[PDB]
Amino acid sequence: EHLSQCQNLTLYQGFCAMKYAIYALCVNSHQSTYLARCQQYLCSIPDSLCLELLENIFSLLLITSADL
Amino acid sequence: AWSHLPHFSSPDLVNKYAIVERLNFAYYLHNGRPSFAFGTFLVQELIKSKTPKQLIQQVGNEAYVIGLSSFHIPSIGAACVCFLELLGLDSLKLRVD
C-alpha cells in the first residue's frame, strides 16, 4: 500500500521527472522550463532511480537518429 | 537497448561512430613547415601511395587549392612554392596566380 506506493512514489517521482526531461529535449531538436522541472524534481528524488535518470540524460547527450 | 552501462565510448556505439583522423599534411603546410612538410608527407604517403602518379596528382591539386586560398598572406605563399618544388612539378601556375 503506502509503503508499496512509497516505492512507487520514487517511481512516480521518476515518472514525474520522466516527462519534464524529454519535453525540454523534445523542442530542443526541431528548434528550458521543462529541463529545470525535471531538474527540480531531480533535486528531491531517490538514489538508484535518480542515478538511472541521470544515466538516461547522459544517453540523451550521446544519442543520434539511430539512437533515436 | 543499451544493456551495457555505456559512456563516451560505448563499444557498439563506438563502432557506430569510430571516426579517426591522422595529421594530414595540411598541418605543416598551413602552419608552414616546408621540409618537414614534404618529409612527413613522404613518411605517411609515399610508401602508402599505391598509385604514385595518381596520388602525386591529387597532392598537387591539394597544394594548388591550399596556395590559392591565401593570396595576401606571404608565408602561406612561400610554403606553397616550396612544397610544389619538392613535389616535382611545375612552379609557374601557383606563382602566376
Curated annotation (Swiss-Prot), chain A:
Location(s), subcellular: Cytoplasm, Cytoskeleton, Microtubule organizing center, Centrosome; Midbody
Top-rank taxon, per record: Eukaryota
Tissue: Strongest expression in the adrenal gland, bone marrow, adult brain, fetal brain, lung, placenta, prostate, skeletal muscle, testis, thymus, and retina. Intermediate levels are detected in other structures, including the spinal cord.
UniProt comment concerning the protein's domains: The FYVE-type zinc finger mediates binding to phosphatidylinositol 3-phosphate and recruitment to the midbody during cytokinesis.
Complex and partners: Interacts with AP5Z1, AP5B1, AP5S1 and SPG11. Interacts with TTC19 and KIF13A.
Disease named in the record: Spastic paraplegia 15, autosomal recessive: A form of spastic paraplegia, a neurodegenerative disorder characterized by a slow, gradual, progressive weakness and spasticity of the lower limbs. Rate of progression and the severity of symptoms are quite variable. Initial symptoms may include difficulty with balance, weakness and stiffness in the legs, muscle spasms, and dragging the toes when walking. In some forms of the disorder, bladder symptoms (such as incontinence) may appear, or the weakness and stiffness may spread to other parts of the body.
Role according to the record: Phosphatidylinositol 3-phosphate-binding protein required for the abscission step in cytokinesis: recruited to the midbody during cytokinesis and acts as a regulator of abscission. May also be required for efficient homologous recombination DNA double-strand break repair.
Protein name per the record: Zinc finger FYVE domain-containing protein 26
Gene responsible for this protein: ZFYVE26
Swiss-Prot record, chain B:
Organ and tissue specificity: Expressed in all structures of brain, with a high expression in cerebellum. Expressed in cortical projection neurons.
Cellular localization per UniProt: Cytoplasm, Cytosol; Nucleus; Cell projection, Axon; Cell projection, Dendrite
Phenotype for residue 34 to L: In SPG11; uncertain significance
UniProt superkingdom: Eukaryota
Quaternary context: Interacts with AP5Z1, AP5B1, AP5S1 and ZFYVE26.
Job of this protein: May play a role in neurite plasticity by maintaining cytoskeleton stability and regulating synaptic vesicle transport.
Known disease link: Spastic paraplegia 11, autosomal recessive: A form of spastic paraplegia, a neurodegenerative disorder characterized by a slow, gradual, progressive weakness and spasticity of the lower limbs. Rate of progression and the severity of symptoms are quite variable. Initial symptoms may include difficulty with balance, weakness and stiffness in the legs, muscle spasms, and dragging the toes when walking. In some forms of the disorder, bladder symptoms (such as incontinence) may appear, or the weakness and stiffness may spread to other parts of the body.
Protein name as catalogued: Spatacsin
Record organism: Homo sapiens (Human)
